């Protein structure tokens, strides 16, 4: 039982941890654009 | 009769242990799903 | 009586499992939906 | 029980929910408004 | 004898259950709304 | 007997109840002014 | 016993809110008025 | 003799009830004022 | 012996207070003074 | 009998934990990994 | 008889207490090192 | 005992809030006087 | 035998009493010492 | 008996706190010079 | 048996600060190194 218990809780913690990449990658990359955006664009002009 | 009442026992306890085993094997991995979920959640954000 | 009664235990586990999931859903969405908000809101700007 | 429990239960949280997007959506109104108009007023000039 | 005592008993248990029912809804309720109320109050302003 | 002491158990508790949420309700009600006061009065000036 | 207990932990909060309120205008009142000067004191000059 | 056995230890329980609760009230009020005056200054300063 | 018992314990509790409170004053103060200190020498500067 | 009880049971608490010590390493380095690229992401950018 | 007797179980007791303190000293290596590797790991990060 | 038990935990608290006192007063004394050579350089230069 | 059993077990609790509570005392001072020295030194720092 | 049993007690007790110590001041020194680096390298530069 | 958990316990705490050390070392250095070359770069061009 144990064997199948703990495999099941490690398999479902790395498709959690997979989700979680996803949208902290999505966020990450949205804030970073913005931020860059607004720099450039003050600063050149 | 001391033999088959043993032998009788231990088996209905060996079932028990079974169905035990099954019924923490679910809550358990209900309460850790839950708890990872708020966790990565919470913190990936 | 025993497989009834842990059969009936278990089902009654596996509902319960799914109302706490169903409303830690809603909690979770609603705290990180207003998290988001209030950082986006107050980076962009 | 359990269903008119957990269903009363998660009525009073989406509720609450709602209180709290109402006061978070005032606060954050106000406080935008006030920076927004620190930086215009400020830069403009 | 046996048969009328076990029913009553029964019965009285399954009377003290609900009481018992009804009186730990209204305590979990009031306990988790207190908690909900503080934790959205805390984090929303 | 069982009536009695449930029903008197029961009122007691809900009693019990208000009082908590009256003096949670100033609680967090001052918490909550102190920290809005602090934050406005920073931010503001 | 509830009545004079609860009726007494209220007032004891109520008078520690009284005090801690004093403090925290004092101390945000130095702190704004430190910033202050200093501002406007840098600017006008 | 059953009559006043019965009288006789009920009313030296609701005495004692009547001590226990005062050493309560007393106990309860000290530990909430330590930690409400622990919260308070914490936080407010 | 039920009164002199209750009156020695609570007298003892009530000493045990006292103590617990002169205790708690000295690391509030402490804390809050050295907060303090940190807070007006880092901000003044 | 005590020494086979004894072994077998060190040994299934060696095997918990090996399956331990996988899923936190799995854990802590998704963990890690997340908050080290958000803080990288965050300052070199 | 009762020289026997007593030795003898003092003798199991003994090394009763060897086997239970060698997993106890496994137990919590194992519980100190986890907490230990997450504290380290968190924080220097 | 409760006296002199109090008397040494109030009397080690007091030395530990000395040495940390001391401890805070150099790390302060530090980070101020770096911060105001930088500024005081920085601006007169 | 009454007089001489009951007055040497009052002794034999008495001095009982005396050893618990040094223990005790020795135990309570090294936990609040420890716990104390991680407080003052984590926050001071 | 009781003096020898206590005696030996609070001897293993006394020397179990001196290993306490040495490990929570090894443990304690190595965060707070981590922490220490960690800040005056970043405020220094 | 304490003898050797605690020696064992002491000394894996003191490869997991190794190990922090160096880890905390390479990421400051390299934040560092980052920041310094941004200031360079920017302020001497």
Do not use: C, H, N, R
């Not at 703990?6 to 654009?33: C, H, K, P, R």
């Amino acid at each position: 039982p144990a064997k199948a218990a703990f495999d099941s809780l490690q398999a479902s913690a790395t498709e959690y941890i997979g989700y979680a990449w996803a949208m902290v990658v999505v966020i990450v990359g949205a804030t970073i654009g913005i931020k860059l955006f607004k720099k450039f664009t003050s600063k050149a002009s």
